[PDB]
Design a protein around this ligand. Structure first.
Ligand SMILES: O=C(O)[C@]1(O)C[C@@H](O)[C@@H](O)[C@H](O)C1
Ligand SMILES: O=C(O)[C@]1(O)C[C@@H](O)[C@@H](O)[C@H](O)C1
Lengths: 498, 498
C-alpha cells in the first residue's frame, strides 16, 4: 500500500531527559519517527513529561504505553493508561498505538476529538506463531472495525516461510498496514517493507536498544541493506544457511548492487528446511541465492539445471532463478575462489567433506600436486571419488604441505576451536582457512607463528562473491570493487545480523 | 532429580551499585540465589565490579554474560567475554552459566582449575518452540558431553501441552536439570519444578524486572503458589480458560489448600484446545480443573460422567479426575453460586448464553420469578429450552427487574465496556455482574448511581469456589475461610498472572 516504508526508532530510555537525547540521536541516524515507549519510564509525570518530549523531539512522535498483558512494562490502572494516551493526542502527538483488545472503547472515547494530523495505530502482537492468511485477514478486519487509522500486526517466525504470509498481508490489505514478523527468522520482513507495502518498520538506535526480537539497527537498514532503494520491483537475493548471522554476503552484494545501480537487495536467509524454503519463495520476486552450510550439497538436488562444474563437484553454492521458466539454475563459485586464493598465496590436505570440501578437493586434483581428505566423520568416500583420513588422526600426519580448512570450525563464536594441533602445523608451507569470521581464526593465528604461509578466508570469500554477482546480475564481475568493499565495509569483527 | 527447586532472582540493574541493592532485595524476598546478568551493565569494570558483587551479595551468585547470539545484550570480543566468566569463577562465584555453543572450549579452559564449591551451568535457549522428547534427549546428551555440572534448557510454549515434555525431561534426566518453558503458556513449568525434578526456577524481584517471558514474581511463587510446599506427590489443579490471566482462582484455592494442609497446588491453565489439553495431562498428577470461558459448555462433552445438575444445565465448570478409573467427572458450581448471591442481594434478565448464562438461567426458572435471555448472537435457543432477546435491543426493554451479566464484558482490561446503556438501568431493582475483575465494573458502577441494588462478581465467585474446593478435596467447604481469603488476598485490582 502507498508510500515507501517509514523507519521508526524505539525510544526506551528510563528517564525523560535520556529519551530526549535518544530522539535527537534518532534524527541524526536518519530515522523518520520515534516510538516513545512510555511504559519504560521509571518515573513518569504525564502532563509535564509528554509536553517536554513533544516540544523537544526533532521527529514526529508515536506514543505507546504498553501494558503487561501485551508484552509491555506498564502495570496499574487501565483508565489512567488511556488518559495518558488521550493526553498525548491532545498535546500534539502524531500517533498513538492502542492495543486491539481495548481499541473500540478507546477510539469511541476520542470520537470527534482528534486533531488534524493525528493517526491512531491499533496493534496486535502474537508471540507464538504466524497465523494462516485466513486468520490474518480476520485479524485485519477486526482491527479495521475498531476505527483504526493504521493496522499493526506483529507475528512470530517459527520458520522463515512464515514471512511470505505477512508479505501477502501488507502487499494486498487495502488499509495502511504495519506488518512485521519477530525473531531472527522473521528479519527479512523488517527489511523488505518498501517492496511489499509495509507502512513502517522499526530500526534500533543501536543493538543494545531492541524493543522486540529481530530488529536491525537504523544504520544497517539505511547503509547495509540500502533501505531507501528498496521498491516494489526490487529483486530479492540472499544467503541461504544455518547459521547465517555471521555472513558478510549481504554487506558486499548490497554495496555492489548500489554501486552499479542494480535494482536488487540481498538479505540473510536463516533456513531450517531448504525444500520448503524454495517452495515458499518461488516467485519472480526472489531471483537468486547464495547457499551456505548446511545447504550446499543439498541445493544441487533442488536445482532444475546444474552447471557442469557444479555437477562434477556435487554441490551448489549459487542459485539463479531464470526469468524465462522460473526454474532454478545451480552453480559453484567455491572451487575457483578457493584454488585461486591458495595459488596466489604461493600435496594438499582438505579438512571437511561438505560442499566447500568437495569444491576445494576437486579443484586441487585438477591443478598440480594432489590431495588428502580429512573429516570428522571418516566415511566422508570423497577421497576415493577424486583419488581419506579422520581428524582424530589429522594431528598425526612431507614437511612443505598445504592445509585447507573448509569446515565451520573456528567460526565465531567458536574462536578457540581449531581443527588441528599447532604442533602438526610446522609440517605445512601454507594453510588456508575458509572461515572469514573472525579474520584471524585460531588456526591461522597458530599457523603463522608456526612459520607457515597463511591465506585467509576473505581471499576466498571475495573471489567467490564477485563471481556470484556476475551470475546474479549478468554484469561483469567488478572484482576491484568487491576487494574495495570488503576492505572498507567488511572488516569489523564479532558482527551478528539477527 | 534430587533437591526441591531453588528460586533464582535475575539481577539486571544497569549499574553495579543498583545490582548490589537488587541482591539484597532478593535475599529479603526469599530468593535462594541471584543470577547476575553482566551483559545488562552499562559500564562494567570486570575485576573491580565482580569483586564488589561477590563480596556484597547476601546470596550465592550465578554469573551470566549473555551474548547477542543467545538472546543477551553483550556485543564485542568473545575471548574477553569468557575472560570475565573465568574471572567470576576464580573470584569465588558459586555458578557461571556458559552457552552450549561454546561450552566445550570453555570448560576445557578451566580444566583442573575449578574451585570446590563451583558449578558450571551449560545452557541452551530455544525461542521458537518446544522440541520432541527425542530432540530434547539429544540436547541433554550434547550438553552433558561438554562437561556441564548442570544442564539448562529453556524452550518456548507454542501450546500448553508443550510443558509436559519439559516435565518428562526434568523428571527423568539423570543429571541436575534446569528445564523451563517460556511464554504465558509455559508458566506452569516455572511453578511446578519441585514436583517434576527441576533444579531451579527464576522468580522476579517485581513484574517490571523480567529477564525471559513468563517469569512470576518471587513473592507469588512463595506466597501465592506456595512454592516450598510443592513436592513429587503434590496433586495439580488449575483454571482451564482463555484468557486466564485475570483469574483469582489460584489465589483462593492455594490459600485454602495450605490452610487445611491439603497436598495440592492450583495454577493458571491457558488452554487453546480443551481436548488436546485433557489428553496431554491425563495422568494422576492432574487431579482436577476449574473450567472458565470458553470451555465450560465444551467440558461437558469431555467428561466421562456428568452430574445431573450439570447435564440439566448443559455446561461443566468443575472437573474431577477420579482416582479409581482415571475418568473425568463433571460438575457445575456456577448455578448455586449465582442464585445464592442474587437472593442474598434481596423476573430476571440474563446477559449471555454461554456456560454461566446457562447455569444462571436454569437456576432462575427454578426459584420464583422467571427469565428473559439476552445475547450478542440472537440464536443463542436457550430461552426456549427453559421458557429470547439480543443485546442490540437490550437497552430497549416492569420497573423492578433483575439484570444478570454472565459474559466477560467489562472484564479487565475492558473496564469501560458495559453490556447495557445506563438509562435502561433505573428499570432494575438489582443487577448482578459475574465479572469480579475489576470488582466495580462499569455496569455495577452505573447501576449503583441508577439507584439499583448491586451484587458483585465476588459474591458469586467465592460461593462457586468453595464448592469446587469440596469437589476437589472431598473436604467440607470451609466457607468462612474462603470469604476471609478473598477479603485478605483477593482484593487487589489490575492483576495479571502471565
Ligand atoms: O556468506 C557466506 O559466508 C558464504 O557461506 C561463504 C561461502 O560459504 C559461499 O560459498 C556462500 O555462498 C556464502
Ligand atoms: O477463575 C475464574 O475467574 C472462574 O472463571 C470464575 C467462574 O467463571 C468459575 O465458574 C470458573 O470455574 C473460574
Amino acid at each position: 500500500v502507498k508510500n515507501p516504508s517509514l523507519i521508526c526508532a524505539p525510544v526506551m530510555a528510563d528517564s525523560i531527559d535520556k529519551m530526549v537525547i535518544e530522539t535527537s540521536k534518532a534524527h541524526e541516524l536518519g530515522a523518520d519517527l520515534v516510538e516513545i515507549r512510555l511504559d519504560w519510564l521509571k518515573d513518569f509525570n504525564p502532563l509535564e513529561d509528554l509536553k517536554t518530549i513533544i516540544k523537544k523531539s526533532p521527529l514526529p512522535t508515536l506514543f505507546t504505553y504498553r501494558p503487561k498483558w501485551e508484552g509491555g512494562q506498564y502495570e496499574g490502572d487501565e483508565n489512567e493508561r488511556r488518559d495518558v494516551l488521550r493526553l498525548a493526542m491532545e498535546l500534539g502527538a502524531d500517533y498513538i498505538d492502542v492495543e486491539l483488545q481495548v481499541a473500540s472503547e478507546f477510539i469511541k472515547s476520542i470520537d470527534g476529538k482528534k486533531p488534524g494530523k493525528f493517526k491512531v495505530i491499533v496493534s496486535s502482537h502474537n508471540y507464538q506463531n504466524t497465523p494462516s492468511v485466513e486468520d490474518l485477514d480476520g485479524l485485519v478486519a477486526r482491527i479495521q472495525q475498531t476505527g483504526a487509522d493504521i493496522v499493526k500486526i506483529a507475528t512470530t517466525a517459527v520458520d522463515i516461510a512464515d514471512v511470505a504470509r505477512m508479505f501477502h498481508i501488507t502487499s494486498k490489505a487495502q488499509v495502511p498496514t504495519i506488518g512485521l514478523v519477530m525473531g531472527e527468522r522473521g528479519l527479512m520482513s523488517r527489511i523488505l517493507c518498501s517492496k511489499f507495502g509495509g507502512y513502517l518498520t522499526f530500526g534500533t538506535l543501536d543493538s543494545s536498544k531492541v524493543s522486540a526480537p529481530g530488529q536491525p539497527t537504523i544504520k544497517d537498514l539505511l547503509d547495509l541493506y540500502n533501505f531507501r532503494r528498496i521498491g516494489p520491483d526490487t529483486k530479492v537475493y540472499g544467503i541461504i544457511g544455518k547459521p547465517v548471522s555471521h555472513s558478510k554476503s549481504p554487506i558486499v552484494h548490497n554495496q555492489a548492487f548500489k554501486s552499479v545501480d542494480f535494482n536488487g537487495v540481498y538479505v540473510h536467509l536463516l533456513v531450517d528446511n531448504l525444500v520448503s524454503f524454495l517452495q515458499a519463495y518461488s516467485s519472480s520476486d526472489f531471483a537468486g541465492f547464495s547457499c551456505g552450510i548446511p545447504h550446499k550439497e543439498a541445493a544441487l538436488q533442488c536445482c532444475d539445471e546444474v552447471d557442469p562444474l557444479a555437477k562434477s563437484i556435487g554441490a551448489v553454492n549459487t542459485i539463479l532463478r531464470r526469468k524465462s521458466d522460473g526454474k532454478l539454475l545451480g552453480y559453484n563459485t567455491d572451487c575457483i575462489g578457493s584454488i585461486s586464493a591458495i595459488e596466489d598465496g604461493l600435496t594438499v590436505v582438505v579438512i571437511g567433506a561438505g560442499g566447500a570440501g568437495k569444491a576445494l578437493a576437486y579443484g586441487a586434483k585438477e591443478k598440480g600436486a594432489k590431495v588428502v581428505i580429512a573429516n570428522r566423520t571418516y566415511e566422508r568416500e570423497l577421497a576415493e571419488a577424486i583419488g581419506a583420513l579422520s581428524l582424530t588422526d589429522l594431528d598425526n600426519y612431507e614437511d612443505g604441505m598445504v592445509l585447507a580448512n573448509t569446515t565451520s570450525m573456528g567460526m565465531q563464536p567458536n574462536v578457540e576451536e581449531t581443527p588441528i594441533s599447532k604442533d602438526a602445523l610446522k609440517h605445512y608451507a601454507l594453510v588456508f582457512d575458509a572461515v572469514y569470521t573472525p579474520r584471524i581464526t585460531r588456526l591461522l593465528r597458530e599457523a603463522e607463528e608456526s612459520g607457515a604461509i597463511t591465506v585467509s578466508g576473505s581471499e576466498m570469500f571475495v573471489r567467490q562473491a564477485y563471481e556470484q554477482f556476475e551470475i546474479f546480475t549478468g554484469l561483469p564481475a567488478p572484482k576491484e570493487l568487491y576487494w574495495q568493499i570488503m576492505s572498507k565495509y567488511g572488516s569489523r569483527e564479532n558482527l551478528y545480523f539477527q
